[PDB]
Nucleic acid binder design. Structure first.
Ligand SMILES: [K+]
Ligand SMILES: [K+]
Ligand SMILES: [K+]
Ligand SMILES: [K+]
Ligand SMILES: [K+]
Ligand SMILES: [Mg+2]
Ligand SMILES: [Mg+2]
Ligand SMILES: [Mg+2]
Ligand SMILES: [Mg+2]
Ligand SMILES: [Mg+2]
Ligand SMILES: [Mg+2]
Ligand SMILES: [Mg+2]
Ligand SMILES: [Mg+2]
Ligand SMILES: [Mg+2]
Ligand SMILES: [Mg+2]
Ligand SMILES: [Mg+2]
Ligand SMILES: [Mg+2]
Ligand SMILES: [Mg+2]
Ligand SMILES: [Mg+2]
Ligand SMILES: [Mg+2]
Ligand SMILES: [Mg+2]
Ligand SMILES: [Mg+2]
Ligand SMILES: [Mg+2]
Ligand SMILES: [Mg+2]
Ligand SMILES: [Mg+2]
Ligand SMILES: [Mg+2]
Ligand SMILES: [Mg+2]
Ligand SMILES: [Mg+2]
Ligand SMILES: [Mg+2]
Ligand SMILES: [Mg+2]
Ligand SMILES: [Mg+2]
Ligand SMILES: [Mg+2]
Ligand SMILES: [Mg+2]
Ligand SMILES: [Mg+2]
Ligand SMILES: [Mg+2]
Ligand SMILES: [Mg+2]
Ligand SMILES: [Mg+2]
Ligand SMILES: [Mg+2]
Ligand SMILES: [Mg+2]
Ligand SMILES: [Mg+2]
Ligand SMILES: [Mg+2]
Ligand SMILES: [Mg+2]
Ligand SMILES: [Mg+2]
Ligand SMILES: [Mg+2]
Ligand SMILES: [Mg+2]
Ligand SMILES: [Mg+2]
Ligand SMILES: [Mg+2]
Ligand SMILES: [Mg+2]
Ligand SMILES: [Mg+2]
Ligand SMILES: [Mg+2]
Ligand SMILES: [Mg+2]
Ligand SMILES: [Mg+2]
Ligand code: NA
Ligand code: NA
Ligand code: NA
Ligand code: NA
Ligand SMILES: [Zn+2]
Lengths: 113, 48, 57, 127, 123
RNA sequence: UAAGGGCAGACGGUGGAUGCCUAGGCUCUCGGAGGCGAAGAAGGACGUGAUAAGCUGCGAAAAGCUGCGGGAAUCGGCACA
RNA sequence: UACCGUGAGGGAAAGGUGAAAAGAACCUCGAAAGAGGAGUGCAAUAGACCCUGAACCCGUCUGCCUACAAGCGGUAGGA
RNA sequence: UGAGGGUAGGGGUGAAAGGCUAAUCAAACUUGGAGAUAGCUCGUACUCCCCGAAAUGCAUUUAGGUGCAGCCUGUUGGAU
RNA sequence: AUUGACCGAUGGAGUGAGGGCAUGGGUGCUAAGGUCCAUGUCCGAGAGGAGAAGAAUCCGGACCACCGGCUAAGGUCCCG
RNA sequence: AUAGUAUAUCGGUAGGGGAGCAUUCCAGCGACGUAGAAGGGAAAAGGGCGACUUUUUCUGGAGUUUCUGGAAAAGCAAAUGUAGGUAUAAGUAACGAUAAAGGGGGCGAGAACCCCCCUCGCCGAAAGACCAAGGUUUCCUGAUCAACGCUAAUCGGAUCAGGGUUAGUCGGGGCCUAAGGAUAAGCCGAAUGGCGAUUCCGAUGGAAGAACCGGUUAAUAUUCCGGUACUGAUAC
RNA sequence: GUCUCAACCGCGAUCUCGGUGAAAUUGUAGUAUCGGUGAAGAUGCCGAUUACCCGCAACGGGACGAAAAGACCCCGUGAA
């Protein structure tokens, strides 16, 4: 018998073209251009999932540095005093406390200073 | 300029006509191949 | 001499920004009331600047 | 089984409130015709007729006679002669129709294709 | 550059251009109004007004000078007959150009030129 | 703000894919048969209709003529008016 | 077969309205092409290139963004 | 210079240029042998999982090919 | 001591254009991002981090996810 | 992967191995469909993972399918790959000899271009007239402007219909032969066949049979008509 | 007027408007500059610099611009 998968072959293309909506020019709807662009984007996402953890830790440290400096202490000396005192609060929590609850942050500083 | 096809009806039939095809064995061999193919035009004698 | 690339839709449409049909300079005829081109004889009535110019049968 | 009859009944009831006219298979290029449609879009009909009558583009004469039809369709579906200053061109669009292919000889035995294009024009009017 | 070059070549050779202006002038004298394009009618005005001015000195020399332009004896008969009497008092400005519209085949600007003393409605 | 442009959606245009379908193909099995022609063949030309380009049938007796067997209300081919 | 070749020879493209032509009388705008109606029909967005009717490509409208801005046009954040 | 004839492919014809022989000539065109052969170039399409090289030696009308060894992998039996 | 890394039989291969660096050398001019061998290593077939941006220099072998933590090479005035 | 949850391991080109999805059709047990099948648009949700699957709604208007097993025309992104369609360059090149046009009337919805008239310009050992070859209705007239015409077109060598070519002497043919061709008797030769007369065929040549001027149609004219001639047969 | 050494004139092309309307080429493009870096000569990488958005005319430095699977050179246990 003769087997041609017309409907199935065309359905594979149509599913991916829903994912390329919003692109510039021919990159959104022309099949070989769009599929090329979509595949390159997936490679970025794998790399950018890792860099997310780097960027958010760098932002926590910067906010902690500004909050500590308003209480006469740099980030490096404040962190050295916390680790010396056994405090295990992580940088995400401290940065949140630095920004939105400045009175609780001041109690952590007053415990090691 | 002068081109390759300069028509002459007397020359055409002498060279390719029905009576010249039938005069030799190889000409009749051509007529048999064209009949077996079902050609509507057998020789230049038909288009006239 | 030769295009290195086909132009995208955007580039072609940006060039065509300055492709506009020119509007006629129209005026109303004080006699007929019809539109006519300013500084020309009204083709309906035949008048021009308040005077008959082309007496039309 | 009455499904397509019920879909079509609603389609016809809506068409009673739409006033429009169509030009189909006009034997001129759609891009040049579009130049004229941009000129009269959203403009009072009495002023547009004079604008089309004295236009320097050749496509305007065809469009002028289609606007007259659109106004007449409006009066048929509303049962009164239209006033002056009342109607206006609420919508107009030009779409490319089917193309007629032809041949034009070129030097050294080559031949090129000529496209003789067509277009459709649709006009809506509104009070 | 064309600084101070005061005549329209009209897209023709010199011999062609002179022949057309002479044929057109004969048509205007015989038919009191003709329809033509605007660029051609403005060039005829500079050509035909001095010729109509020569009928104020009715002599053999004036007729022959005019004939050297038109080379048409019916135009000469009309020019020194009825046309001469109508313009005997007007100090120049014998003709008038009025614009009319555009042609179908090439969208050329159209007008009509006529002798002023033959248009009664505009007097 | 938008001369213009970008993206999304709605509704259309063009084009003729896809789904469904068949009127034609392809490979074989079983049985028969294996020629036509000087009594002019195969293949053609020209004709042939109330109307008649082209096919089909036919041959100046020219969409046809005569018998015998069958069959029973429509018929003057494709094919209309 | 059309078509190409002096000739031997080479050699295409092209299927589908509807159950039934019931294949759209008549009116309106137009010089008439084209359309809007009316009518037939289960359906006319089945109207003759007519079943369904995709893509590339092409329009109109609506929402948001855009005239101090510089790189494979996305990706991860984010008013 | 017109008309009509004649010479046909390793053949013709050539005041000789390998010129010309239907816009094709150091061997015309058409069909067939025929899907010639091409140690050469280009191309080879659904998914996930486990393992994972070589570009060395020898020989070769061999050197950008191949045979055997070396190095990978499946199954099976031994310990090494 | 060693996650087992070695061998035999038998089914299936690919490879037989290598390259950089360090060390020992020949050749060259103690030239070459040169060339020919030997011993390791990495690229080839290897992403991540530092070096402004570099196939093989320095650190380090990516099952997937995380808006958790500790470190390597290298850094801690600002772009960072 | 090993042991039966524990330990180890999970970057990969050539390449080896394992396990699956979709497609067309078949067998079996069975289901769905005008109270709406396949296909097409939109949306939502699933899968150790994935190839893919499911549901809802619009269109559509007649077929479709679960599971187990079976068989293949069983899956495209690239081959200066093929067909069909549609883009870009772009409203760009170009509209085919620089002999040339202007005006007034006309028919007409519509005129730079069509018809008539006046003027202008070009050829005139030709760009005028008559034949041959070749073409084959393009010739004249009415209707038509979709396509064709490198623009428009009321016009056309365009579409449709009707009409139009008249010979005793003209040109052929009937007669004759040239180059060459086909043969007879004969000769040669695996076959197919090759040669071969004073015979026949074959004009581009030779004929002892003979016509010229004029006029008429929208379209024929030594052909029809007028005038004036000529050449064969045949009967008295 | 070949040149020193060019100047001016006429028509056709050219430019603008109306009518008709192709082609070669084309992975996608929001396509600036300098030096560096680099398959060793960068619109697209790095660091700086400059730059409001969109056309038209005109000229050819670059896109190792297009065209044609380099004829030179070497290779094939190729061909004529
Ligand atoms: K559609
Ligand atoms: K801004
Ligand atoms: K040969
Ligand atoms: K099926
Ligand atoms: K006519
Ligand atoms: Mg422009
Ligand atoms: Mg057209
Ligand atoms: Mg106009
Ligand atoms: Mg030619
Ligand atoms: Mg659509
Ligand atoms: Mg189909
Ligand atoms: Mg009987
Ligand atoms: Mg529908
Ligand atoms: Mg349809
Ligand atoms: Mg600034
Ligand atoms: Mg030589
Ligand atoms: Mg030749
Ligand atoms: Mg040879
Ligand atoms: Mg063989
Ligand atoms: Mg082959
Ligand atoms: Mg491994
Ligand atoms: Mg080799
Ligand atoms: Mg081997
Ligand atoms: Mg080797
Ligand atoms: Mg080697
Ligand atoms: Mg080296
Ligand atoms: Mg060395
Ligand atoms: Mg080397
Ligand atoms: Mg490695
Ligand atoms: Mg690992
Ligand atoms: Mg792996
Ligand atoms: Mg297949
Ligand atoms: Mg190419
Ligand atoms: Mg250009
Ligand atoms: Mg230009
Ligand atoms: Mg040209
Ligand atoms: Mg031009
Ligand atoms: Mg011309
Ligand atoms: Mg002549
Ligand atoms: Mg005629
Ligand atoms: Mg036309
Ligand atoms: Mg005719
Ligand atoms: Mg005779
Ligand atoms: Mg004889
Ligand atoms: Mg005649
Ligand atoms: Mg006569
Ligand atoms: Mg000029
Ligand atoms: Mg133009
Ligand atoms: Mg550089
Ligand atoms: Mg650069
Ligand atoms: Mg090049
Ligand atoms: Mg090559
Ligand atoms: Na805007
Ligand atoms: Na008989
Ligand atoms: Na439904
Ligand atoms: Na496909
Ligand atoms: Zn008026």
């Amino acid at each position: 018998p003769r087997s041609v998968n017309h409907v199935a072959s065309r359905a594979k293309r149509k599913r991916i073209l829903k994912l390329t909506r919003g692109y510039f020019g021919a990159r959104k709807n022309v099949w070989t251009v769009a599929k090329n662009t979509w595949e390159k984007g997936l490679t970025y996402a794998y790399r950018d999932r890792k860099s997310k953890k780097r960027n958010f830790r760098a932002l926590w440290i910067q906010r902690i540095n500004a909050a500590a400096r308003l209480e006469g202490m740099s980030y490096s000396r404040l962190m050295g005093a916390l680790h010396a005192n056994g405090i295990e609060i992580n940088r995400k929590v401290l940065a949140d406390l630095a920004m939105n609850h400045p009175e609780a942050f001041r109690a952590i500083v007053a415990k090691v200073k | 300029m002068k081109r390759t096809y300069q028509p002459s009806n007397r020359k055409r039939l002498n060279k390719h006509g029905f009576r010249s095809r039938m005069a030799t064995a190889n000409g009749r061999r051509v007529l048999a191949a064209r009949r077996a193919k079902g050609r509507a035009k057998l020789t230049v004698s038909d288009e006239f | 001499a030769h295009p290195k690339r086909r132009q995208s839709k955007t580039r072609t449409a940006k060039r065509r920004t300055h492709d506009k049909a020119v509007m006629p300079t129209l005026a109303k005829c004080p006699n007929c009331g019809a539109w006519h081109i300013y500084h020309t004889v009204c083709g309906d009535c035949g008048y021009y600047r308040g005077k008959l110019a082309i007496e039309k049968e | 089984g009455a499904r397509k009859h019920n879909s079509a009944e609603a389609r016809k009831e809506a068409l009673k409130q739409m006033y429009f006219a169509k030009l189909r298979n006009v034997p001129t290029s759609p891009r040049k015709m579009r130049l004229v449609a941009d000129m009269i879009r959203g403009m009072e009909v009495n002023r547009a007729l004079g604008v089309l009558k004295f236009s320097n583009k050749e496509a305007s004469a065809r469009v002028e006679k289609l606007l007259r039809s659109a106004v007449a369709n409006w009066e048929e579906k509303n049962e009164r002669k239209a006033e002056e200053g009342e109607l206006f061109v609420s919508r107009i669009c030009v779409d490319g129709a089917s193309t007629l292919k032809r041949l034009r000889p070129a030097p050294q035995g080559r031949g090129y294709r000529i496209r003789k294009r067509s277009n459709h024009v649709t006009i809506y009017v509104d009070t | 550059m064309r600084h101070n070059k005061k005549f329209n070549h009209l897209g023709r050779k010199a011999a062609h251009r002179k022949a057309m202006l002479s044929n057109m002038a004969a048509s205007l004298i015989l038919h009191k109004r003709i329809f033509t394009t605007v660029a051609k009618a403005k060039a005829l005005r500079i050509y035909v007004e001095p010729l109509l001015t020569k009928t104020k000195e009715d002599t053999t020399h004036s007729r022959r000078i005019a004939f050297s332009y038109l080379q048409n004896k019916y135009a000469l008969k009309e020019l020194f007959g009825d046309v001469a009497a109508k313009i005997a008092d007007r100090p120049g400005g014998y003709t008038r150009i009025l614009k009319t519209g555009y042609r179908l085949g090439d969208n050329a600007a159209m007008c009509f030129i006529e002798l002023v003393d033959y248009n009664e409605n505009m007097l």
